[PDB]
Design a protein around this nucleic acid. Structure first.
Lengths: 52, 210, 203, 102, 147
RNA sequence: CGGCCCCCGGCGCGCCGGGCCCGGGUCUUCCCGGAGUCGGGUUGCUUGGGAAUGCAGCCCAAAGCGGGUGGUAAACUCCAU
RNA sequence: CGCGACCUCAGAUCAGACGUGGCGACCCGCUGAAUUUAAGCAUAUUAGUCAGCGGAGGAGAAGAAACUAACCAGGAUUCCCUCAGUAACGGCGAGUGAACAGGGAAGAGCCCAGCGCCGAAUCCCCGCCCCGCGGCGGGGCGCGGGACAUGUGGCGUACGGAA
């Protein structure tokens, strides 16, 4: 039927919980290589560049 | 066939509800349809507020709420006659006018008058002709305002009054709230019957004379 | 003017002057056909209060309606089912008899449109009504801003959909706690909203 | 002393002053104008009385007001309309007897 | 997740987890709450007492707005106001006695459950309890009504 | 937020031919209510509406400080809309 | 024994227009069950649902209170949430089952009869002239006809209005 429960709602604190853990896992380069990304030549993992 | 402690449930599924299932997959498209028409509504009235005409200060009925202040249907004619705006001019200038609203109180009347009085002060009435007629606005008031007012015009603040820390006197301490409340509850019940015992006794005092 | 007295005279129907007039008229309309055109209104003030104006294009008809309820259109018995639906004699039609007169006037004359109707007499076997019809294409109504709303195709056959005053009362619609139905669009729409189970995206 | 705005008993509700206001013109309806009074007596003069009122003329003549009121109650409807029917017909007796005892 | 359902482990078993002697028929006991008095009486007696019969009077047009009366106890009374209100009390050699408006927050009746710390107060509420007063009056406060 | 060529539309400006010279406040004098309709009885259907929520057939059938409503029928009296 | 008005009623291959039928997902007005449940079954439930009939529209219907409320009162209608699986109905069994208020989306009010006042001051049709005419209109000229006093048009509708 068309009226199956297609959508799932998650609490806003829980949705904000995973994004804090996702951003904090963008550091710790053992996590980034375990995803498969080639980081060996990056001078620093938290790459911050100018507004240019 | 219930078994081992469930609630006695009464599902209202005995009708043919499957023919009348209302799905809500239109919700994101309806939100875009309402929003894209809301922006288009605000662009046709370029200097006018997007929310529309001014709403009055209105207190709730139904003593459950009894304290909240809503946005009303419109300003009553008794409120408009105090402010000096004719009821057929307030519609054109941007004031919500309804004829049904009664005015039983007085503090709420001045609340709506003061809302209308300072509304005329901040209002920028454009002249009909580019050459401005009488009682319009100066050209200096025009050029620094080319924007609308997002949200309701003069949003209604549900405000309270801050109290001074009063020093309790002994005159206040003698008051009994529970004893006076029970006395007043009993007086309301017995007000009508006590009016009967007095009148027949007074009619029995007529028997003393007659 | 004289319109006030004619109104208040017609409210004293039990008075002997009106019993003579109601007797002569109901005798006269019984000898005619069940549907024919009247040239001028029998009750002018009642026609004007309902929206009739004496100008070109305003037509009126008169329709005889049989008195009684509604016998169920089934053979002798033949009402197979539970004993609730075994009654065929004491059944009353849900729509008013005056609205039937509007219904039959527009069925025979599909070119015109009914505004409203009013009572002109009754007998023990018949009820007489006069229905006001409007030419939609006559230039007297077509060029009049007050009356060219009926020329719109939205008001096609108002007598069929129950939009006249006689058909509006049969729908049981109105404001307040006295009804508690017809609270959506109509009585059918009120039943719809209370029976469509709203399933959201997130529930 | 201790005059507090109690929520129950003979003065309940928040204490607010009430402004004097003219009544709405919608409330005026139902008041008898002399013009429609000037119309209504002529209609009663022309077409006369109803058959149920003409039968109730004699019960007012013989001072049988309890049976006269019971007849009107079965003939008109509720007791409020049945009562109000009685005195105006009783005013017909007073007007006719005074106009005959000259 | 249908892959964690019991139906996937039941593939192969003839009866599909519903008995071999008594098969899973359509409705053995009856549809819904069939037989409140008959053949299901024991379940209704020893698990839902008082299900059958009338009791009390009938109030036809009952509106929840008249019977609205939210309650608050004296133990959760200083949470109605900010923390700096109560620390600015029992001080300044005045007996400041701050006013806590119960109706302002959205409660009507004040009940006497809990222990009130020793600080005189002024409470503004539409209703009060007898045991509510003697705790406030015992502390040294005063109750003021409002409509 | 690319280009070129056609067709249609509305908003602005000007010209011609017309229609329209139509306000608010104070005081004085007038007027203002839709009938076989409301309502009542009965019957049938419907409704959560239960001493009848609503709709219909029959009978009775009005008034104007009147009438309707104020979820229990009826009588009396203050009110509210 | 005729002519001439008026009222009612006809005949038209009269002059000029109008309706029919179809689709019918959504809507409106009727009519309208039985399967099924109640472990039977008759009230109930299915259900004012399936079927049948008529009617239009791009939306329809409804719509500016003979309203809700008893409050320090709200204020057309339509839709969502909530009230609520609640008040209430029900062999008080199965089951059925709203409404007020509040938060929102949207938000626009009005017109007649009557009462009155203005010389019918009103409207329809035919002929002529000017303009544009592939949604037949605007202005002027016609003791050119008709409708209309059994009432057209202007002011004017409960928020009072008129002089």
């Amino acid at each position: 039927k068309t009226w199956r429960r297609w959508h799932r709602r998650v609490n806003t604190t829980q949705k904000r919980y995973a994004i804090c853990s996702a951003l904090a896992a963008s550091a710790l380069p053992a996590l980034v290589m375990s995803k498969g990304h080639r980081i060996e030549e990056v001078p620093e993992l938290p790459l911050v560049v100018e507004d240019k | 066939a219930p078994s081992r402690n469930g609630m006695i449930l009464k599902p209202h599924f005995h009708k043919d509800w499957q023919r009348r299932v209302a799905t809500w997959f239109n919700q994101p498209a309806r939100k875009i349809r309402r929003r894209k028409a809301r922006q288009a509504r605000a662009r046709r009235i370029a200097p006018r507020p997007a929310s529309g005409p001014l709403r009055p200060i209105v207190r709730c009925p139904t003593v459950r709420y009894h304290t909240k202040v809503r946005a009303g249907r419109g300003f009553s004619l008794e409120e408009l006659r105090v402010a000096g705006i004719h009821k057929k001019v307030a519609r054109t200038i941007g004031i919500s006018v309804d004829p049904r609203r009664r005015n039983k109180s007085t503090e709420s009347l001045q609340a709506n008058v003061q809302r209308l009085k300072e509304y005329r002060s901040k209002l920028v009435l454009f002249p009909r002709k580019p050459s401005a007629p009488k009682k319009g606005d100066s050209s200096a008031e025009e050029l620094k305002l080319a924007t609308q007012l997002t949200g309701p015009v003069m949003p209604i603040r549900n405000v309270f009054k801050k109290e001074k820390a009063r020093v309790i006197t002994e005159e206040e301490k003698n008051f009994k709230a529970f004893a006076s409340l029970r006395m007043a509850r009993a007086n309301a019940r017995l007000f009508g019957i006590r009016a009967k015992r007095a009148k027949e006794a007074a009619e029995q005092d007529v028997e003393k004379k007659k | 003017g004289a319109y006030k007295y004619i109104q208040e005279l017609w409210r004293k129907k039990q008075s002997d002057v009106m019993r003579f007039l109601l007797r002569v008229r109901c005798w006269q309309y019984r000898q005619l056909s069940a549907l024919h055109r009247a040239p001028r209104p029998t009750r002018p003030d009642k026609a004007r209060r309902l929206g009739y104006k004496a100008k070109q294009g305003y037509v009126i008809y008169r329709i005889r309606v049989r008195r009684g309820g509604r016998k169920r259109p089934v053979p002798k018995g033949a009402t197979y089912g539970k004993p609730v639906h075994h009654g065929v004699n004491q059944l009353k039609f849900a729509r008013s008899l005056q609205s039937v007169a509007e219904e039959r006037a527009g069925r025979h004359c599909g070119a015109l449109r009914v505004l409203n109707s009013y009572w002109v007499g009754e007998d023990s076997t018949y009820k007489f009504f006069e229905v006001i019809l409007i030419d939609p294409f006559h230039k007297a109504i077509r060029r009049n801003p007050d009356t060219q709303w009926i020329t719109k195709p939205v008001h096609k056959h108002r007598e069929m959909r129950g939009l006249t005053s006689a058909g509006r009362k049969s729908r049981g619609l109105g404001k307040g706690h006295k009804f508690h139905h017809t609270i959506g669009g109509s009585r059918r729409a009120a039943w719809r909203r209370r029976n469509t189970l709203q399933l959201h995206r997130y529930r | 002393a201790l005059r507090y705005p109690m929520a129950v008993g003979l003065n309940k509700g928040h204490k607010v002053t009430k402004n004097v206001s003219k009544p709405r013109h919608s409330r005026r309806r139902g008041r008898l104008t002399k013009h429609t009074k000037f119309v209504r007596d002529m209609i009663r003069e022309v077409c006369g009385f109803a058959p149920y009122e003409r039968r109730a003329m004699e019960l007012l003549k013989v001072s049988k007001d309890k049976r006269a009121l019971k007849f009107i109650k079965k003939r008109v409807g509720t007791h409020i309309r049945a009562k109000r029917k009685r005195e105006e017909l009783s005013s017909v007796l007073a007007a006719m007897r005074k106009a005959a005892a000259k | 997740p249908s892959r964690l359902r019991k139906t996937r482990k039941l593939r192969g078993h003839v009866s599909h987890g519903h008995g071999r002697i008594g098969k899973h028929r359509k409705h053995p006991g009856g549809r819904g709450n069939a037989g409140g008095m008959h053949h299901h009486r024991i379940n209704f007696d020893k698990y839902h007492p008082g299900y059958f019969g009338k009791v009390g009077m009938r109030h036809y047009h009952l509106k929840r707005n008249q019977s609205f009366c939210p309650t608050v106890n004296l133990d959760k009374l200083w949470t109605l106001v900010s923390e700096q209100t109560r620390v600015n009390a029992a001080k300044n050699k005045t007996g400041a006695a701050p006013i806590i408006d119960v109706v302002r927050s959205g409660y009507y009746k004040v009940l006497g459950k809990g222990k009130l710390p020793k600080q005189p107060v002024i409470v503004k509420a539409k209703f009060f309890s007898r045991r509510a007063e003697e705790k406030i009056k015992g502390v040294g406060g005063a109750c003021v009504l409002v409509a």
